[PDB]
Amino acid sequence: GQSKRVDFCGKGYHLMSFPQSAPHGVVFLHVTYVPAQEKNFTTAPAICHD
Amino acid sequence: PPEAEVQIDRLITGRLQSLQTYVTQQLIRAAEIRASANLAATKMSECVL
C-alpha cells in the first residue's frame, strides 16, 4: 500500500517500499519523495475580482 | 566458622532471591514503559508533525 502516516515508512512523503530478507528479521527499503530547491513568494488568502 | 557458614548460606540464598525478584519486576515494568514510549513517539510523528 501507500501509507500516509508521517515517518512511519521513512522520512519524506512515502511512495512505495520493497522488503528484503535477513537472518532473523526483515529489512525494508522505503522510497520517499523529498522537496528540494524552493523559492519564496508573496501570498494571499483570496483574490478580489468584481 | 563451620556453624556460622550454615547460617550465612541461609541468608545469602534469601538475599539473592530478593534481588532476583526485584530485577524481574523491573524488567516487566520496563517493557510496559517501552510500549508507552513507542506510543508517544508515534503520536509525536503523527499528531505533532
Side-chain angles (χ1 to χ4, degrees):
Chain A
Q2 182 179 24
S3 177
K4 295 185 183 297
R5 292 168 68 187
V6 174
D7 297 348
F8 181 69
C9 300
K11 185 175 175 71
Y13 295 96
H14 180 260
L15 296 173
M16 61 184 172
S17 302
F18 304 105
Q20 296 285 272
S21 177
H24 298 294
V26 65
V27 178
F28 294 97
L29 306 179
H30 301 296
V31 181
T32 67
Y33 177 93
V34 180
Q37 289 87 325
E38 62 180 346
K39 292 179 181 180
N40 291 316
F41 301 97
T42 297
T43 189
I47 298 299
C48 184
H49 180 71
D50 59 353
Chain B
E3 292 295 315
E5 288 177 350
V6 173
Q7 299 304 313
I8 294 168
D9 284 346
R10 290 179 186 179
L11 293 176
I12 292 169
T13 299
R15 295 269 168 81
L16 292 174
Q17 290 291 306
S18 293
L19 292 173
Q20 184 63 233
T21 299
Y22 171 80
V23 172
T24 301
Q25 293 296 308
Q26 293 298 96
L27 266 55
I28 293 168
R29 289 175 182 175
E32 294 177 356
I33 295 297
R34 187 182 299 108
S36 183
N38 287 342
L39 179 60
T42 299
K43 287 173 176 279
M44 191 68 77
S45 294
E46 297 181 5
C47 300
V48 175
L49 287 94

PDB file of all heavy atoms in Angstrom, chain B residues 21-34:
ATOM      1  N   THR B  21      14.002 -11.102  42.496  1.00  0.00           N
ATOM      2  CA  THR B  21      12.608 -10.733  42.373  1.00  0.00           C
ATOM      3  C   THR B  21      12.530  -9.299  41.917  1.00  0.00           C
ATOM      4  O   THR B  21      11.751  -8.984  41.019  1.00  0.00           O
ATOM      5  CB  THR B  21      11.838 -10.926  43.683  1.00  0.00           C
ATOM      6  OG1 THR B  21      11.880 -12.303  44.050  1.00  0.00           O
ATOM      7  CG2 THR B  21      10.382 -10.511  43.503  1.00  0.00           C
ATOM      8  N   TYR B  22      13.345  -8.432  42.508  1.00  0.00           N
ATOM      9  CA  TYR B  22      13.385  -7.041  42.121  1.00  0.00           C
ATOM     10  C   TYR B  22      13.709  -6.878  40.670  1.00  0.00           C
ATOM     11  O   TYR B  22      13.001  -6.169  39.958  1.00  0.00           O
ATOM     12  CB  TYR B  22      14.400  -6.286  42.948  1.00  0.00           C
ATOM     13  CG  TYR B  22      14.676  -4.896  42.494  1.00  0.00           C
ATOM     14  CD1 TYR B  22      13.829  -3.883  42.799  1.00  0.00           C
ATOM     15  CD2 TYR B  22      15.817  -4.638  41.781  1.00  0.00           C
ATOM     16  CE1 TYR B  22      14.115  -2.613  42.386  1.00  0.00           C
ATOM     17  CE2 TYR B  22      16.099  -3.378  41.375  1.00  0.00           C
ATOM     18  CZ  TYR B  22      15.251  -2.371  41.674  1.00  0.00           C
ATOM     19  OH  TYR B  22      15.538  -1.095  41.271  1.00  0.00           O
ATOM     20  N   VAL B  23      14.754  -7.537  40.206  1.00  0.00           N
ATOM     21  CA  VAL B  23      15.148  -7.367  38.834  1.00  0.00           C
ATOM     22  C   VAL B  23      14.064  -7.845  37.901  1.00  0.00           C
ATOM     23  O   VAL B  23      13.795  -7.182  36.905  1.00  0.00           O
ATOM     24  CB  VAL B  23      16.470  -8.082  38.546  1.00  0.00           C
ATOM     25  CG1 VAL B  23      16.788  -8.063  37.067  1.00  0.00           C
ATOM     26  CG2 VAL B  23      17.571  -7.386  39.290  1.00  0.00           C
ATOM     27  N   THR B  24      13.439  -8.974  38.187  1.00  0.00           N
ATOM     28  CA  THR B  24      12.406  -9.477  37.306  1.00  0.00           C
ATOM     29  C   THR B  24      11.258  -8.488  37.207  1.00  0.00           C
ATOM     30  O   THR B  24      10.745  -8.237  36.113  1.00  0.00           O
ATOM     31  CB  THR B  24      11.875 -10.823  37.790  1.00  0.00           C
ATOM     32  OG1 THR B  24      12.955 -11.757  37.835  1.00  0.00           O
ATOM     33  CG2 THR B  24      10.828 -11.331  36.823  1.00  0.00           C
ATOM     34  N   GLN B  25      10.845  -7.911  38.330  1.00  0.00           N
ATOM     35  CA  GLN B  25       9.758  -6.956  38.281  1.00  0.00           C
ATOM     36  C   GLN B  25      10.148  -5.706  37.520  1.00  0.00           C
ATOM     37  O   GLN B  25       9.325  -5.155  36.787  1.00  0.00           O
ATOM     38  CB  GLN B  25       9.332  -6.567  39.683  1.00  0.00           C
ATOM     39  CG  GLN B  25       8.701  -7.674  40.447  1.00  0.00           C
ATOM     40  CD  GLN B  25       7.450  -8.117  39.843  1.00  0.00           C
ATOM     41  OE1 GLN B  25       6.562  -7.313  39.567  1.00  0.00           O
ATOM     42  NE2 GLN B  25       7.349  -9.409  39.607  1.00  0.00           N
ATOM     43  N   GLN B  26      11.405  -5.268  37.626  1.00  0.00           N
ATOM     44  CA  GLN B  26      11.794  -4.082  36.893  1.00  0.00           C
ATOM     45  C   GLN B  26      11.776  -4.354  35.408  1.00  0.00           C
ATOM     46  O   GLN B  26      11.361  -3.490  34.645  1.00  0.00           O
ATOM     47  CB  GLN B  26      13.178  -3.590  37.290  1.00  0.00           C
ATOM     48  CG  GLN B  26      13.286  -3.070  38.693  1.00  0.00           C
ATOM     49  CD  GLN B  26      12.434  -1.878  38.982  1.00  0.00           C
ATOM     50  OE1 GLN B  26      11.320  -2.009  39.495  1.00  0.00           O
ATOM     51  NE2 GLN B  26      12.942  -0.695  38.685  1.00  0.00           N
ATOM     52  N   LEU B  27      12.153  -5.560  34.985  1.00  0.00           N
ATOM     53  CA  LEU B  27      12.126  -5.882  33.566  1.00  0.00           C
ATOM     54  C   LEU B  27      10.724  -5.899  33.016  1.00  0.00           C
ATOM     55  O   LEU B  27      10.475  -5.396  31.916  1.00  0.00           O
ATOM     56  CB  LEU B  27      12.776  -7.232  33.313  1.00  0.00           C
ATOM     57  CG  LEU B  27      14.251  -7.237  32.949  1.00  0.00           C
ATOM     58  CD1 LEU B  27      15.074  -6.514  33.977  1.00  0.00           C
ATOM     59  CD2 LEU B  27      14.703  -8.650  32.862  1.00  0.00           C
ATOM     60  N   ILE B  28       9.786  -6.418  33.783  1.00  0.00           N
ATOM     61  CA  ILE B  28       8.423  -6.438  33.314  1.00  0.00           C
ATOM     62  C   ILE B  28       7.898  -5.016  33.211  1.00  0.00           C
ATOM     63  O   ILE B  28       7.292  -4.652  32.202  1.00  0.00           O
ATOM     64  CB  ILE B  28       7.548  -7.319  34.211  1.00  0.00           C
ATOM     65  CG1 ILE B  28       8.016  -8.788  34.035  1.00  0.00           C
ATOM     66  CG2 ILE B  28       6.066  -7.153  33.860  1.00  0.00           C
ATOM     67  CD1 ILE B  28       7.478  -9.766  35.043  1.00  0.00           C
ATOM     68  N   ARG B  29       8.140  -4.197  34.225  1.00  0.00           N
ATOM     69  CA  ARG B  29       7.654  -2.832  34.189  1.00  0.00           C
ATOM     70  C   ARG B  29       8.275  -2.051  33.064  1.00  0.00           C
ATOM     71  O   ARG B  29       7.617  -1.208  32.458  1.00  0.00           O
ATOM     72  CB  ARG B  29       7.979  -2.118  35.467  1.00  0.00           C
ATOM     73  CG  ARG B  29       7.210  -2.559  36.653  1.00  0.00           C
ATOM     74  CD  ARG B  29       7.689  -1.878  37.833  1.00  0.00           C
ATOM     75  NE  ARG B  29       7.011  -2.301  39.014  1.00  0.00           N
ATOM     76  CZ  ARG B  29       7.340  -1.899  40.239  1.00  0.00           C
ATOM     77  NH1 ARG B  29       8.338  -1.067  40.394  1.00  0.00           N
ATOM     78  NH2 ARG B  29       6.652  -2.331  41.278  1.00  0.00           N
ATOM     79  N   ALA B  30       9.546  -2.288  32.799  1.00  0.00           N
ATOM     80  CA  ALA B  30      10.235  -1.588  31.751  1.00  0.00           C
ATOM     81  C   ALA B  30       9.633  -1.885  30.415  1.00  0.00           C
ATOM     82  O   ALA B  30       9.618  -1.014  29.552  1.00  0.00           O
ATOM     83  CB  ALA B  30      11.672  -1.953  31.744  1.00  0.00           C
ATOM     84  N   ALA B  31       9.167  -3.110  30.209  1.00  0.00           N
ATOM     85  CA  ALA B  31       8.552  -3.453  28.950  1.00  0.00           C
ATOM     86  C   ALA B  31       7.293  -2.632  28.734  1.00  0.00           C
ATOM     87  O   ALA B  31       7.000  -2.223  27.605  1.00  0.00           O
ATOM     88  CB  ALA B  31       8.239  -4.922  28.917  1.00  0.00           C
ATOM     89  N   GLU B  32       6.561  -2.378  29.816  1.00  0.00           N
ATOM     90  CA  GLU B  32       5.340  -1.591  29.741  1.00  0.00           C
ATOM     91  C   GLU B  32       5.665  -0.135  29.431  1.00  0.00           C
ATOM     92  O   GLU B  32       4.979   0.510  28.630  1.00  0.00           O
ATOM     93  CB  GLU B  32       4.572  -1.717  31.037  1.00  0.00           C
ATOM     94  CG  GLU B  32       4.065  -3.115  31.256  1.00  0.00           C
ATOM     95  CD  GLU B  32       3.360  -3.309  32.558  1.00  0.00           C
ATOM     96  OE1 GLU B  32       3.326  -2.384  33.329  1.00  0.00           O
ATOM     97  OE2 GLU B  32       2.861  -4.402  32.791  1.00  0.00           O
ATOM     98  N   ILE B  33       6.749   0.363  30.016  1.00  0.00           N
ATOM     99  CA  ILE B  33       7.197   1.714  29.740  1.00  0.00           C
ATOM    100  C   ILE B  33       7.628   1.817  28.312  1.00  0.00           C
ATOM    101  O   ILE B  33       7.371   2.832  27.679  1.00  0.00           O
ATOM    102  CB  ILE B  33       8.340   2.164  30.647  1.00  0.00           C
ATOM    103  CG1 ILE B  33       7.891   2.261  32.106  1.00  0.00           C
ATOM    104  CG2 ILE B  33       8.937   3.486  30.173  1.00  0.00           C
ATOM    105  CD1 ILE B  33       6.807   3.281  32.433  1.00  0.00           C
ATOM    106  N   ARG B  34       8.331   0.815  27.802  1.00  0.00           N
ATOM    107  CA  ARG B  34       8.757   0.871  26.428  1.00  0.00           C
ATOM    108  C   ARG B  34       7.573   1.005  25.519  1.00  0.00           C
ATOM    109  O   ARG B  34       7.610   1.803  24.589  1.00  0.00           O
ATOM    110  CB  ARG B  34       9.509  -0.362  26.015  1.00  0.00           C
ATOM    111  CG  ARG B  34      10.105  -0.260  24.636  1.00  0.00           C
ATOM    112  CD  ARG B  34      10.811  -1.478  24.207  1.00  0.00           C
ATOM    113  NE  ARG B  34      11.948  -1.835  25.056  1.00  0.00           N
ATOM    114  CZ  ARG B  34      11.997  -2.886  25.919  1.00  0.00           C
ATOM    115  NH1 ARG B  34      10.984  -3.687  26.096  1.00  0.00           N
ATOM    116  NH2 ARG B  34      13.101  -3.116  26.589  1.00  0.00           N
TER     117      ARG B  34
END
